[PDB]
Amino acid sequence: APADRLKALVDAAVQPVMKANDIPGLAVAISLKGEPHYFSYGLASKEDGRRVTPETLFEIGSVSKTFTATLAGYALAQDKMRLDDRASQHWPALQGSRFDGISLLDLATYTAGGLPLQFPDSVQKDQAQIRDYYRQWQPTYAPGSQRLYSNPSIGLFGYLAARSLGQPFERLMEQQVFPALGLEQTHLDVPEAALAQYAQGYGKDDRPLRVGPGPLDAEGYGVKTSAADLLRFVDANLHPERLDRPWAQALDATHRGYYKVGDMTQGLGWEAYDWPISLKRLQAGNSTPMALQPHRIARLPAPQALEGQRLLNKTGSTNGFGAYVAFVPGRDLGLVILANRNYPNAERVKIAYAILSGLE
Numbered sequence: 001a002p003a004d005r006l007k008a009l010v011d012a013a014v015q016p017v018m019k020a021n022d023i024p025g026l027a028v029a030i031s032l033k034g035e036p037h038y039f040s041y042g043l044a045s046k047e048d049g050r051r052v053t054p055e056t057l058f059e060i061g062s063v064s065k066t067f068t069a070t071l072a073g074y075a076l077a078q079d080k081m082r083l084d085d086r087a088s089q090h091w092p093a094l095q096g097s098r099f100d101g102i103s104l105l106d107l108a109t110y111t112a113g114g115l116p117l118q119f120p121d122s123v124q125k126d127q128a129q130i131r132d133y134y135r136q137w138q139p140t141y142a143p144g145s146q147r148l149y150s151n152p153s154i155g156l157f158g159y160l161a162a163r164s165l166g167q168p169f170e171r172l173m174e175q176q177v178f179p180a181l182g183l184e185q186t187h188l189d190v191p192e193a194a195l196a197q198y199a200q201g202y203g204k205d206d207r208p209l210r211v212g213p214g215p216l217d218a219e220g221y222g223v224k225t226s227a228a229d230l231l232r233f234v235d236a237n238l239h240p241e242r243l244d245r246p247w248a249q250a251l252d253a254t255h256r257g258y259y260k261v262g263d264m265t266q267g268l269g270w271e272a273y274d275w276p277i278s279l280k281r282l283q284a285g286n287s288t289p290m291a292l293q294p295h296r297i298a299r300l301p302a303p304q305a306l307e308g309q310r311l312l313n314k315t316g317s318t319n320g321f322g323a324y325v326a327f328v329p330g331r332d333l334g335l336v337i338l339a340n341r342n343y344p345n346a347e348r349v350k351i352a353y354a355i356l357s358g359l360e
């Protein structure tokens with residue numbers, strides 16, 4: 001009966017949203033009081049009929065920012081950087097630029113002063129072009145005043161965290177972070193031997209879409225993972241104390257809130273809400289205006305622990321994929337929803353809320 005009831009709950013949440021948003025394939029993974037549960041739907045590739053499983057690789061887009069935040073958490077744990085460091089401390093090319101007056105915390109939490117959502121199309125994936133973009137950039141408004149969600153912002157945060165550790169970002173993630181977290185199905189660059197697991201992404205007219213190269217792609221949106229591996233990452237977040245101490249500290253650093261915008265408290269990578277909260281408020285925190293428009297922050301007098309009666313979440317997208325992760329620290333509950341269509345955040349939150357409400 002319990003297995004029947006959980007399947008009925010997850011099917012009732014997922015099936016209508018997959019039909020309504022024409023989602024070819026979707027993987028759910030749930031962590032419930034220390035037990036994993038998997039529900040897999042539809043096709044990883046329509047053309048060859050390959051089914052989604054909990055081992056199918058999906059692009060998770062901006063959920064990658066929580067991995068980037070974890071690497072920065074490790075640099076913080078090792079005293080290689082501080083959040084109040086000036087950004088230019090960690091990259092001499094930026095000495096004498098406006099990054100002399102911008103903190104690593106501003107970059108991490110999108111408050112550097114108007115760095116845009118994406119790099120402009122004029123900046124290709126090229127070390128010199130990225131360098132020259134930051135050297136010339138000037139804030140629209142005072143650092144630490146307005147949140148404008150931004151890949152160049154947290155991307156530079158991750159880049160500088162890697163520089164503080166003396167190695168390239170992608171190398172540190174592959175050689176140190178993923179192994180420390182027990183993740184063998186999590187990739188920035190999918191190996192040839194794993195390509196058979198890589199789902200197809202679908203856009204307009206079902207155009208096939210896998211993510212192409214871009215500046216600081218690894219830091220902003222580069223992770224491909226399975227539902228089973230992303231749930232292992234959620235379980236690490238629910239129990240940092242089970243990891244070796246420097247990695248436990250790295251994860252704890254991603255559970256600290258610095259300011260509020262509306263109902264949302266901004267951490268490193270993770271975004272948090274009081275729990276319970278209405279579905280409409282959770283959708284509004286994850287809305288298009290929250291992602292695209294500047295918002296004045298309400299700064300906390302001290303960093304706030306993102307634990308207890310809270311939901312921590314992150315949306316992530318690419319042109320072909322739509323991911324959502326949410327967990328409730330004080331209930332030992334975690335959820336992953338990975339799909340191969342970029343379907344609206346409101347609909348991802350609708351699935352998650354139905355499941356989390358039904359487990360509670």
Ligand SMILES: *[B]([O])([O])[C]([C]N1[C]=C(C([O])=O)N=N1)[N]C(=O)[C]C1=[C][C]=[C]S1
Nearest residue numbers: 061062063151221291315316317318319
């Ligand atoms: B991340 O998912 O927040 C980020 C930016 N983004 C896209 C969306 C969306 O479409 O709803 N919301 N936020 N993702 C990326 O920059 C990766 C992309 C690669 C190609 C298109 S988006």
